[PDB]
Subunit: 400 residues, 4 copies
Amino acid sequence: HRALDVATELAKTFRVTVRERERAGGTPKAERDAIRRSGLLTLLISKERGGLGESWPTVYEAIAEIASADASLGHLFGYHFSNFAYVDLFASPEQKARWYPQAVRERWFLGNASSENNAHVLDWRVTATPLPDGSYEINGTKAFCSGSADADRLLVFAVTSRDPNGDGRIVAALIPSDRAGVQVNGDWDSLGMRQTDSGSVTFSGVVVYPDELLGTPGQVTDAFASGSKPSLWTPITQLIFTHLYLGIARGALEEAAHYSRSHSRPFTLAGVEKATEDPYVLAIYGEFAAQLQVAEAGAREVALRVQELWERNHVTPEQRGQLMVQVASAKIVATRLVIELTSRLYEAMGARAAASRQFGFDRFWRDARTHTLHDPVAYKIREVGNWFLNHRFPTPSFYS
Amino acid sequence: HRALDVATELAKTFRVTVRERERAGGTPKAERDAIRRSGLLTLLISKERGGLGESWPTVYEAIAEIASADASLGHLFGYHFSNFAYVDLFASPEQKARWYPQAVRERWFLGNASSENNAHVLDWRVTATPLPDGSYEINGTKAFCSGSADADRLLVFAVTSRDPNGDGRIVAALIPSDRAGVQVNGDWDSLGMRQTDSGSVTFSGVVVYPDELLGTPGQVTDAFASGSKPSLWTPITQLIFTHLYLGIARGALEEAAHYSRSHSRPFTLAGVEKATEDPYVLAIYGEFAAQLQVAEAGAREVALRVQELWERNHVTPEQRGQLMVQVASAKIVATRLVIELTSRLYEAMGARAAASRQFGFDRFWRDARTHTLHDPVAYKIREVGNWFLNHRFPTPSFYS
Amino acid sequence: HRALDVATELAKTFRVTVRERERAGGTPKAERDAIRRSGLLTLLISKERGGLGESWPTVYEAIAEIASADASLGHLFGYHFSNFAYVDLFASPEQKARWYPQAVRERWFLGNASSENNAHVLDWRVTATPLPDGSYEINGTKAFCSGSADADRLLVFAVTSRDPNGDGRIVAALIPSDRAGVQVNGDWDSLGMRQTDSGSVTFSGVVVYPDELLGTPGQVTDAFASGSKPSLWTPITQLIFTHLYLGIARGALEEAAHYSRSHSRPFTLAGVEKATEDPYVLAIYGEFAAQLQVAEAGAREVALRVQELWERNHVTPEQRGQLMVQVASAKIVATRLVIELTSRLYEAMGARAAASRQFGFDRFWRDARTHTLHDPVAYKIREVGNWFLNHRFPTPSFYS
Amino acid sequence: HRALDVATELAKTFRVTVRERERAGGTPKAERDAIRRSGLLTLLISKERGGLGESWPTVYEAIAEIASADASLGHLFGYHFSNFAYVDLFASPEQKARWYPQAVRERWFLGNASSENNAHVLDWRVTATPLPDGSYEINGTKAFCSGSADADRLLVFAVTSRDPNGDGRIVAALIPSDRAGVQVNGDWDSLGMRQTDSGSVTFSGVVVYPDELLGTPGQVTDAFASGSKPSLWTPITQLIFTHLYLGIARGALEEAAHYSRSHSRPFTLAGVEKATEDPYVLAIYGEFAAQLQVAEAGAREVALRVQELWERNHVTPEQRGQLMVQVASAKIVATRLVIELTSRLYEAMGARAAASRQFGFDRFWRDARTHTLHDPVAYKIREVGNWFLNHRFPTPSFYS
Ligand SMILES: Cc1cc2nc3c(=O)[nH]c(=O)nc-3n(C[C@H](O)[C@H](O)[C@H](O)COP(=O)(O)O)c2cc1C
Ligand SMILES: Cc1cc2nc3c(=O)[nH]c(=O)nc-3n(C[C@H](O)[C@H](O)[C@H](O)COP(=O)(O)O)c2cc1C
Ligand SMILES: Cc1cc2nc3c(=O)[nH]c(=O)nc-3n(C[C@H](O)[C@H](O)[C@H](O)COP(=O)(O)O)c2cc1C
Ligand SMILES: Cc1cc2nc3c(=O)[nH]c(=O)nc-3n(C[C@H](O)[C@H](O)[C@H](O)COP(=O)(O)O)c2cc1C
Ligand SMILES: c1ccc2c(c1)sc1ccccc12
Ligand SMILES: c1ccc2c(c1)sc1ccccc12
Ligand SMILES: c1ccc2c(c1)sc1ccccc12
């Protein structure tokens, strides 16, 4: 229970200052260094390599706990583990032996530069052109690069260009954020998630060496199309997002409840003597706490299944498909829950909870409302419907 | 897995005939006898006493499976385990050493006569008059006596009367359904749950012998008041109801999807070519399938905790209260899900699914609409809200 | 107020017997004759021609009031006016001069035979083949022929075949229901709307004469595509459906309230002394009555606009499209309301309202759930959204 | 039509600057002066007295129009008419003969100081101490004094103290905001409604002269208890709030639609090519636009009834109660609509609508979420339920 106690203490510390920090935006450097000092960035690194030797259920619980205190830090922490998962699923034994002890000693906090701001999510224009001796050169701009500021290593994706062994192949690499030609742009000014540093990143002639490549170019496409073990990356990552939404939900419900207990006035016009005994206040808390209990219990079960399949040598298409359906279902339910709860709970607190902007309760809705648009919930709903009605598992990809 | 395989095969046979049987109402004797021959009524009896020595997770899964095929049979089966749970929590070791091998040998299917139709659910008027030899005489009429027809034993509740040691004290007993003076009235004629035989039972001078009594007078009240282990009866039973709702929900979704694949016509007016590719059909299946996956996953966690506390020698009010809150939340979510989907799934099927009465899909809504009224979900919502906001566990009762 | 008083009195009488009549299904001949005697079938015929010279707001109010007592009689009554509206929009001056006094004298109650059960709703295969002197012969089977039993005249639609003047043109005619070769099949057996007689009708060599044709073959296609005055038929008819749903909603709300005042028990476990003072019972009635008040007030405005445009010589595409959008909006809101309310009101009444099948409250949900599937509400929603987002009015058709 | 054209033009100009102005908060002096110059503040003053002699339907439509551009200015404009309505309902004919020509000539924009921040609403501590001449000395601080800054007159409420003719009676008056001892505090820093100046006002020995008093002490209480014409103030004012919510809803829908047409990217992962043709985007717009059409149509009818009763010399409790129920119903529907729509419309726009804080669409949710808490919608729901189920009209008060 030690790692979770560490995460709980981190979250308590983050609650004290999140109101003022999130207003200013920018990089939460002091808090990222506290996470570095905590050791939790090493949860999934084996003890033999210097890490904590912990499991995915612990990682998910820590993500939700931190997210309940500070959604931007929960996002950054969770995305670190999405990046780590990708690295771990493709790294060679040589790379793990070098990188993981280094990640412990240098306290790596991983960032990524993957998505782009073109015509659609599939229009990728960051290229990797081959160099002598097996290196590549990266050129172009990436968007929504969560945790790219103050990241020690960047997980980067590019498409092979002018490549004699095949253009259009997806290359992934793990490079130092201070490699020449890498420019983090710090242009993140959002409604919520205001400290995630999810702005754009530009690559000018950036060299990637062979010992930084995560598999051969195109290997990710083969692993996903085949259902190899790396196809677990998408359910793992979407369950990370699910735990952000559940953490935000619980944080909002608990903060509202503290307000109601200490500050809400009874509607004596209707004969109520105490706001905490009002039947409609109690009904609001009961409706949302009930949905949260069921969603949290369901999320714990799916997290245990993530761990189970993580440990297998091979995951069948049925096992991976079933997991992806369970994860998508959890994310759908958590998305609806957090969006509704963070808005409707004002009705349990009363007008003064909005009349003083500084109370800051709208941070929960602003964070949830921003992040949940990460990928459209309508098409997660369509994928679950296509599975149930047509017996079609989602196609493994970066989004399903 | 053997036990769940047997339940799955039972459910398959019940699906073949449920549409015809439930119209008639009345007692599903052949199907009750099939359940008797299956051995599953002995799921929770230890192997040492001739039973299967299985766990509550298996019982709850079996309940949902059967209920997905025939909600009345799922109800009869589930209430048998509610009755069994009461006996197990209150009978002496000496009584259980006699009753349980007899229940196995005689293939006992339990019913109950407990609630009444007076001014409100607390108002009980069926009396137990003490006789000099330690026996009691029972007089009065009970309502909603599920499984009272064809029952090998009835779990019966009465309040003491003409009692020098105190009137109004609740006594419970397990008695043969054909004991002199017991009249099963056969007046069950309901919207849904049409074969549960939940009619009235009239007791005329019915003798109860000392070795048929479950505890002492008022003992159930004392156990409720102290939140001790016998008060687990309520979360156990409320979780039985939850699994009826999850089972009905799954059955309705599967039956609707079969119609959507086989008979629904594409809305060509809007350019649709296949109903199974219609975006709004797919969204209905996705939304409800997603909520069902999360609810079923959370329900499995709560069932594991039921088993945990069932095996304990002592249970504290905090353990019992936390379990009751988790059960209540599961019941709330399942109630809303089943009531919504059994009505809205018609929109995924089309007009002819209702215009052809013989299709009989309305059975799912009728069954769920009837059963979910067992006790008011508004007060399960209040109970979860009072816990979350005011840190007050539900007051243990026959309902909470 | 005379006409509305007559409809109110009719509805009063229908309420006495609807519970018994709709169980049996079949043709409500006695009630149809009571409507004939009332004169209300002539509401839209000018006094000059022997009718009442009333307005569409009166028709719509009468439809909703009758539907609140008996949805099948409300449906038959309303569809009579959809049939009359089609006739009035396409009939020649000499057809009106002959038919309308005859409809008054003979107390005509109209039915129709229009839709079919082929691959999709566009797919019409009942043929009209030329005969000498401009007559046509009709062959094939129609489905969903509301009011086709006991009909004085049938509005029938067919597609021309082996026609020198052009194949595949839609022809419409108003013919006697007992003409040789017309076989009303009497096969309506529905979940709800059980006395609308909406079964199939088979046409074997049925002769239609030129003086029974409603415009030339294909004229309806041209009138809808061009937005000439007959394009009002669809918003008129969809608003008829809307008033069926509002009528059912009001009838259900009022019937539930009577049960709650008379029979519901207080939940004394939570300290409630009277069910009519329960905060959650009150919230259910308040939610649904509030939405009903708004929906009804909105529907009055749209019905007035129907009358205003009905009196216009020419209606622009803006005026027709805005009306169709207002009608579709009213129908969407009414559909959601009646489907939710007819199911959720059980929670304000209690278990015994469902456990005693004879109470028959489920008739409201059965009727509403059946009729609201007439055409898919998802595509009414799309039509309103296409208008608001893209400024595209719905393409006029039999559906929009 | 001229007045509404003027309001539409005002709203056009407000939309240009609202994003920048509402961020700063404070007093929108230039825009208040634009409203002064428009003459619309005199809409309800008779032409005889120099006003526009217009109707409440015109006022309500102008309130919604302005609120759709700038919710704070719509609120200020709307509350001006609430203040005016109170004056008209309680002022003597002689008072109006002086005040209304002055309000025209001096372009009065009214504010109020009425509510307070004590243990519960209606727990009032601002006192009125009688002076020998019939004046009152006012002492205390008022809360939520909308429009208190830059107000030409304040409508003020106090409770009598040290009063031989009875303590605790409510007095009301209309006084200059620069009367000696009046301090408008400017302490308003809110989530939304950021330019309504709803801070506190402190009265230090403020003398109120006899010709400024509105009625006699406790007359407002007696009017409420009688349900007589002056108690129309509450339904009038609650319908003002309703039109704020309908205006915010319409403004949010149109602003979102503009973004969707201009900036939303199609989700090619699913094969869609234009965001404005996405089936789920279209469903969101259609669902909310449909609900909005019906709500707006219904609100127009209730506004016509406000005008009817406003022109009567006497109003019965039944007429007032029926109107209050209709107003409560409109408020309930509008509240639910605006709160859902201002949050869910992000799903129709996509992530970049929230990633760019400066888009500023969250203003609609912040404004609606703040104002809808004015009084709890849960008790409007109970009030409508108590009327429908128990035939009890709402108890007249400042809130019902
Ligand atoms: C708060 C937030 C954080 C995001 N973080 C990442 C990220 O770390 N890596 C990535 O590839 N995309 C990230 N995305 C991008 C989304 O996956 C997606 O590309 C984007 O939301 C599409 O925007 P649209 O809906 O306007 O088309 C993020 C998006 C949001 C809103
Ligand atoms: C934006 C806003 C403006 C308000 N303006 C006024 C006002 O002008 N006059 C008034 O008496 N109350 C005003 N109120 C207050 C309500 O009457 C009520 O006192 C308050 O909303 C209750 O606060 P609570 O729910 O936190 O207990 C306003 C409230 C809000 C939220
Ligand atoms: C109760 C009911 C009555 C109907 N009455 C008629 C009718 O009178 N004339 C007609 O053309 N269609 C009628 N329809 C049919 C619709 O036009 C449409 O063909 C049908 O609902 C589509 O069926 P589907 O959703 O199963 O494909 C009726 C449908 C229902 C449910
Ligand atoms: C389908 C159904 C089955 C029921 N079976 C039982 C039962 O077996 N034993 C029992 O004590 N109560 C049973 N109940 C009754 C509830 O405990 C409760 O008394 C009843 O639902 C309250 O009815 P009311 O809401 O109309 O007041 C049953 C209720 C329903 C609806
Ligand atoms: C109140 C009292 C006893 C019981 C209920 C409600 S449901 C049920 C099911 C089985 C056995 C007893 C009881
Ligand atoms: C397609 C074509 C004709 C008709 C429908 C659908 S519903 C209806 C109701 C009355 C008369 C004609 C029609
Ligand atoms: C309680 C008492 C007075 C008032 C409210 C609530 S809102 C409002 C708006 C304008 C004028 C007076 C009041």
